[PDB]
Design a protein around this nucleic acid. Structure first.
Ligand SMILES: [Mg+2]
Ligand SMILES: [Mg+2]
Ligand SMILES: [Mg+2]
Ligand SMILES: [Mg+2]
Ligand SMILES: [Mg+2]
Ligand SMILES: [Mg+2]
Ligand SMILES: [Mg+2]
Ligand SMILES: [Mg+2]
Ligand SMILES: [Mg+2]
Ligand SMILES: [Mg+2]
Ligand SMILES: [Mg+2]
Ligand SMILES: [Mg+2]
Ligand SMILES: [Mg+2]
Ligand SMILES: [Mg+2]
Ligand SMILES: [Mg+2]
Ligand SMILES: [Mg+2]
Ligand SMILES: [Mg+2]
Ligand SMILES: [Mg+2]
Ligand SMILES: [Mg+2]
Ligand SMILES: [Mg+2]
Ligand SMILES: [Mg+2]
Ligand SMILES: [Mg+2]
Ligand SMILES: [Mg+2]
Ligand SMILES: [Mg+2]
Ligand SMILES: [Mg+2]
Ligand SMILES: [Mg+2]
Ligand SMILES: [Mg+2]
Ligand SMILES: [Mg+2]
Ligand SMILES: [Mg+2]
Ligand SMILES: [Mg+2]
Ligand SMILES: [Mg+2]
Ligand SMILES: [Mg+2]
Ligand SMILES: [Mg+2]
Ligand SMILES: [Mg+2]
Ligand SMILES: [Mg+2]
Ligand SMILES: [Mg+2]
Ligand SMILES: [Mg+2]
Ligand SMILES: [Mg+2]
Ligand SMILES: [Mg+2]
Ligand SMILES: [Mg+2]
Ligand SMILES: [Mg+2]
Ligand SMILES: [Mg+2]
Ligand SMILES: [Mg+2]
Ligand SMILES: [Mg+2]
Ligand SMILES: [Mg+2]
Ligand SMILES: [Mg+2]
Ligand SMILES: [Mg+2]
Ligand SMILES: [Mg+2]
Ligand SMILES: [Mg+2]
Ligand SMILES: [Mg+2]
Ligand SMILES: [Mg+2]
Ligand SMILES: [Mg+2]
Ligand SMILES: [Mg+2]
Ligand SMILES: [Mg+2]
Ligand SMILES: [Mg+2]
Ligand SMILES: [Mg+2]
Ligand SMILES: [Mg+2]
Ligand SMILES: [Mg+2]
Ligand SMILES: [Mg+2]
Ligand SMILES: [Mg+2]
Ligand SMILES: [Mg+2]
Ligand SMILES: [Mg+2]
Ligand SMILES: [Mg+2]
Ligand SMILES: [Mg+2]
Ligand SMILES: [Mg+2]
Ligand SMILES: [Mg+2]
Ligand SMILES: [Mg+2]
Ligand SMILES: [Mg+2]
Ligand SMILES: [Zn+2]
Lengths: 104, 85, 124, 208, 138
RNA sequence: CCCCAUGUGGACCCGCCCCUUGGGGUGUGUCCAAAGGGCUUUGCCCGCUUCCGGAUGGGCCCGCGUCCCAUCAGCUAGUUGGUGGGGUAAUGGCCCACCAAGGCGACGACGGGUAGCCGGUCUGAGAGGAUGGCCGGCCACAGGGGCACUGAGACACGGGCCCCACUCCUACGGGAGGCAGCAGUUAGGAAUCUUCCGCAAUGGGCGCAAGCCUGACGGAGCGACGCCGCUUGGAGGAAGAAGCCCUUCGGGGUGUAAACUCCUGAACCCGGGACGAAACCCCCGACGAGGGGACUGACGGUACCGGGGUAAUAGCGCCGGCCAACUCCGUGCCAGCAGCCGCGGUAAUACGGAGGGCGCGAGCGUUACCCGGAUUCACUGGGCGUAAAGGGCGUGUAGGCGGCCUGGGGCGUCCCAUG
RNA sequence: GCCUACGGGCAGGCGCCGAGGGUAGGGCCCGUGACUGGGGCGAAGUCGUAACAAGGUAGCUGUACCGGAAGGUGCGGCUGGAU
């Protein structure tokens, strides 16, 4: 079985490619809570067909570029911006968190 | 080339061998493909040789040339013997 | 803590600091002596205790108790040292091993002899 | 090595009779018969109450001393006995009792356990027709424990088997007096051994 | 706010019993009523009855005690000596069958939520399944 | 080594059919093979060529797991993707050219520190901590740094080319060398072995074989370094010699201990004496099966057996409490002990000696280090009014968590079968 | 220049990449170290007596100013302030 994951598009800005955000839950190896870690996959979109907000399936694939080792498999559910927002605001807050400084 | 040979497993002055299939090049006592019976040169037991014929027959059937002492031990448990007319 | 707190921040294991750093991990080191002097003990105790200052193969200059009823240490004695603090003499976290290099065993010692490098006498 | 040295004395430190000696341990000479106090300058003076350690310790020693045996061989058996399916307290004694040195003595070839170890070590003993001289060899059930064909004529061999005229041998054993053979039938259940030990205290001493 | 309503149920019973209340009401829930149904069978409570407080669904738990005692404090032995929530929100506790535990050498209960129902440790181990380890009782 | 031919077959472009990332088939065009040697010479043995599958060994790629510091918070420009081209066995910014402006980070990027990873091992009730020689599996290096050449396979420890540092030879133009292979030298250090035997065995390379090679390996040597096994005797023997110790001077202790009596017989002496080794081979038979025959032992004159046969190493810690074990003497806050609390300033069960005792025993102690004890980082399993601990107070982002009923999905979760 | 079957090959010459070195200019980590800060100690003395009793001016605290220091006072705050 070539691996298959499910996730969301968070990036158009690449040529024939999408960034897919994949979540995974699992119990913590010591404290046994269920924890929600995540990962970003670079997925070959040969036709631009997949837009951001699309949840997609993505499949293990013969290497495309340096980071691209997955092909976009099919569309699971399109239009789902809430997730993408959570990605961007998580990102935006990073520009805080610093030490060079802040404002008012 | 794959071989059927002996892997020592005794102590010192207590040689206990193990008949095995493995790539020519591996350490005398290394990771082996498959074990096919033991052999005890000093015969401390009524059962100082077992072989599992039908497997060895398989491995010979894809050309696992066996060492000389091994062919002998194999032969002795009749891996090679045919029948009748 | 809550759980989420431990998932977030974990538990901090406890690092052990070595009460015998001069012996960089070994059980004894050799050195030569600089100062071999007497030193006055601490809190409720009185005496004149025998101490050597020793320059080690580990670079460190440390001071070492010389055990035993009477010794023979000097300005260039080659000696061997082990772990073992002395509560009364502060800043002394090593003992000198007797009967090795230039440290004689105690003479006349007839009891805990192995702890003082004295060999077993005949005709006793 | 094993303990050689003065014995009727441990007889006295343990305050009970260990039978480490032999013909006189039974006579009016065991000094338990004459000085039941412990050895030394101070054995006359009234005792302090024992610490738990004390009682745990001594009960261990009493048992060990009875059987000859080094602490390293002893602890290693108690260790083996715990790894056994069984009631280790009992399993232990069964293991002890399985020693050739001991089997021989219980068989009545040797006057005592100490004398037994020599009988073994100097080669006077057959196990299943062959020679054995490790006092530590473990006798299993079904084993036949004979006197060497050679050593058949010793004074003590003959003198001891003539005491068997009127003793009878342990219930897990069978003696062939005339033929000078004994057979080891099964392991002695706890009730067969009647030692003056509280095996449980031994166990407790080791779980510290 | 309320976050665990099964904790809340158990704890309602706990606190009740310690004051020897004859009975206490607990806001209802298909689930809770299952756990109660269990507690009933095993004899920790005389039973529960479904009632209505201001047109709100509730569950009257009727507690059970020991007999009066002599001596200078006569407050009966508890029947539910110790009730305690195991899987909680913000740390769930799933157990495989060969990991379902024994409560007080067999004398107590562990209540389990499984794809085959709300089961006691024994009930579950008999049906060969495991699940969420809700609470323990004794 | 090279060209021409036959080409079963394969390789390449192009087209079609199935399949679906470069998979299988098919059609025209092209293009591609080869080696001989031996003999028991009219046929056997070894080797050669193209191709299909097996077998075994590797390349590459992905999910998940993989130490400490946030008093390192932003990192990145071949960087991130595209198109085309080069290279390779093959994917790929692996390389190059042009185009786009991306990629990663508080779920800890980047930076600093430390470390080869695992099967296991130590400890622990577990959970966890700690560790990864020796055996086995993977990796990485072969004086430091580059680099490619031969080839199925290397960017190659005892192969090559260059630079650097080191050492040696030198006629001063230049050249040589690489034990982190075995043994050994030397330095460093608290500390770590013989410049041994043998290719008899197993394994490996080359050969039709005989054989050659093999510091892989099989053994011996040195070191109580560890574990295990064995010995220094066994039985009898006084109301209990001497000597040493205590004493209330009556006696008590070492102590059945000794002596002495019988018994046994490690050491050692003589004799026998191994298994490990039967194939390769040769003969019959067919070259197969199967049968017959011979050669071969480092260990080793060892283990082991038989006969003879001598009473024949004991030491170390400890004895105030934890903690099994007590008295005298000397000493006098001295000498000294001391893991911790403490002891010693004239009656010391704590210093030192002695007698006696306890604990282990060819070992016993010490130091160093890991785990334990330490629910003293608390998942199991802890806390915060006064003991250390609630942010000075709010707002609210990410995140964490969340009522009652019904139904679908089945991600978590649970069960079965299988790898 | 060499070989040739005239198709081409070999030596050689140039170029990119490149270990390494050169100049300048930053950043980082260890070795030594002139001169220095207190600090903890550690033998029983100097001069005080701030705190503990209402400690003889209730005590403590942030922040100021004075003082070498202990402390004193100012402004608030606290009771962990005695009748
Ligand atoms: Mg040997
Ligand atoms: Mg290999
Ligand atoms: Mg510790
Ligand atoms: Mg323990
Ligand atoms: Mg599970
Ligand atoms: Mg095709
Ligand atoms: Mg051709
Ligand atoms: Mg030719
Ligand atoms: Mg560019
Ligand atoms: Mg490309
Ligand atoms: Mg390293
Ligand atoms: Mg624990
Ligand atoms: Mg473990
Ligand atoms: Mg590790
Ligand atoms: Mg290895
Ligand atoms: Mg290894
Ligand atoms: Mg070197
Ligand atoms: Mg290199
Ligand atoms: Mg090579
Ligand atoms: Mg390499
Ligand atoms: Mg070399
Ligand atoms: Mg070497
Ligand atoms: Mg040196
Ligand atoms: Mg060979
Ligand atoms: Mg070897
Ligand atoms: Mg040895
Ligand atoms: Mg030693
Ligand atoms: Mg031993
Ligand atoms: Mg006397
Ligand atoms: Mg005797
Ligand atoms: Mg004799
Ligand atoms: Mg032989
Ligand atoms: Mg033979
Ligand atoms: Mg033959
Ligand atoms: Mg040969
Ligand atoms: Mg023939
Ligand atoms: Mg001989
Ligand atoms: Mg003999
Ligand atoms: Mg004899
Ligand atoms: Mg003697
Ligand atoms: Mg102890
Ligand atoms: Mg005591
Ligand atoms: Mg001492
Ligand atoms: Mg002491
Ligand atoms: Mg003393
Ligand atoms: Mg003595
Ligand atoms: Mg003694
Ligand atoms: Mg712990
Ligand atoms: Mg907790
Ligand atoms: Mg606490
Ligand atoms: Mg306070
Ligand atoms: Mg506080
Ligand atoms: Mg507050
Ligand atoms: Mg505060
Ligand atoms: Mg929110
Ligand atoms: Mg939620
Ligand atoms: Mg909910
Ligand atoms: Mg529902
Ligand atoms: Mg449903
Ligand atoms: Mg389903
Ligand atoms: Mg599911
Ligand atoms: Mg599950
Ligand atoms: Mg450069
Ligand atoms: Mg005052
Ligand atoms: Mg005042
Ligand atoms: Mg004043
Ligand atoms: Mg003023
Ligand atoms: Mg004020
Ligand atoms: Zn006796």
């Amino acid at each position: 079985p070539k691996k298959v994951l499910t996730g969301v598009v968070v990036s158009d800005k690449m040529q024939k490619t999408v960034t897919v955000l994949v979540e995974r839950q699992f119990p913590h190896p010591l404290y046994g809570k269920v924890i929600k870690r995540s990962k970003k996959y670079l997925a070959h979109d040969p036709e631009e067909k997949y837009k951001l907000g699309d949840v997609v399936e993505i499949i293990e694939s013969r290497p495309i570029s340096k980071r691209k080792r997955f092909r976009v498999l099919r569309l699971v559910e399109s239009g789902r911006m809430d997730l993408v927002e959570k990605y961007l605001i998580r990102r935006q807050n990073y520009e805080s968190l610093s030490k060079r400084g802040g404002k008012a | 080339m794959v071989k059927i040979r002996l892997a020592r497993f005794g102590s010192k002055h207590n040689p206990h061998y193990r008949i095995v299939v493995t790539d020519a090049r591996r350490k005398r006592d290394g990771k082996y493909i498959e074990k096919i019976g033991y052999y005890d040169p000093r015969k401390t037991t009524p059962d100082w040789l077992k072989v599992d014929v039908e497997r060895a027959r398989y491995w010979l059937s894809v050309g696992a040339q066996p060492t000389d002492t091994a062919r002998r031990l194999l032969r002795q448990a009749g891996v090679f013997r045919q029948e009748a007319r | 803590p809550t759980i989420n707190q431990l998932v977030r921040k974990g538990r901090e294991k406890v690092r052990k600091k070595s009460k015998v750093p001069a012996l960089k991990g070994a059980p004894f080191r050799r050195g030569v002596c600089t100062v071999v002097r007497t030193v006055t003990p601490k809190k409720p105790n009185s005496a004149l205790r025998k101490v050597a200052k020793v320059r080690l193969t580990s670079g460190y200059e440390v001071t070492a108790y010389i055990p035993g009823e009477g010794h023979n240490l000097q300005e260039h004695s080659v000696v061997l040292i082990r772990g073992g603090r002395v509560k009364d003499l502060p800043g002394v976290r090593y003992h000198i091993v007797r009967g090795v290099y230039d440290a004689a065993g105690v003479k006349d010692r007839k009891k805990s002899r192995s702890k003082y490098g004295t060999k077993k006498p005949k005709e006793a | 090595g094993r303990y050689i040295g003065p014995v009727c004395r441990l007889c006295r430190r343990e305050g009970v009779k260990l039978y480490l000696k032999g013909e006189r341990c039974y006579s009016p000479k065991c000094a338990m018969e004459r000085r039941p106090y412990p050895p030394g300058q101070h054995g006359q003076k009234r005792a302090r109450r024992p610490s738990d350690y004390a009682v745990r310790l001594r009960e261990k020693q009493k048992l060990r001393r009875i059987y000859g045996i080094s602490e390293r061989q002893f602890r290693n058996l108690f260790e083996e006995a715990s790894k056994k399916k069984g009631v280790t307290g009992s399993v232990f004694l069964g293991l002890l009792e399985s020693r050739l040195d001991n089997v021989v003595y219980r068989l009545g070839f040797a006057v005592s356990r100490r004398q037994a170890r020599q009988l073994v070590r100097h080669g006077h003993i057959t196990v299943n027709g062959r020679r054995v001289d490790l006092p530590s060899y473990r006798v299993r059930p079904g084993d036949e424990i004979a006197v060497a064909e050679k050593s058949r004529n010793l004074e003590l061999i003959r003198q001891n088997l003539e005491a068997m005229k009127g003793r009878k041998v342990g219930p897990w054993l069978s003696l062939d007096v005339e033929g000078m053979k004994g057979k080891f039938l099964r392991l002695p259940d706890r009730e067969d051994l009647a030692l003056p030990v509280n095996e449980q205290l031994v166990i407790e001493f080791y779980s510290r | 706010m309320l976050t665990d309503p099964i904790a809340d149920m158990l704890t309602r019973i706990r606190n009740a019993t310690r004051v020897y209340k004859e009975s206490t009401d607990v806001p209802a829930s298909r689930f809770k009523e299952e756990i109660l149904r269990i507690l009933a069978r095993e004899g920790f409570i005389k039973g529960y009855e479904r009632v209505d407080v201001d047109g709100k669904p509730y569950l009257r738990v009727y507690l059970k005690y020991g007999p009066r005692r002599q001596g200078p404090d006569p407050r009966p032995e508890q029947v539910i000596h110790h009730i305690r929530r195991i899987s909680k929100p913000g740390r769930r506790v799933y157990v495989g069958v060969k990991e379902i535990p024994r409560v007080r050498r067999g004398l107590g209960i562990a209540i389990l939520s499984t794809s085959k129902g709300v089961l006691t440790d024994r009930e579950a181990r008999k049906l060969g399944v495991g699940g969420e380890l809700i609470c323990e009782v004794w």
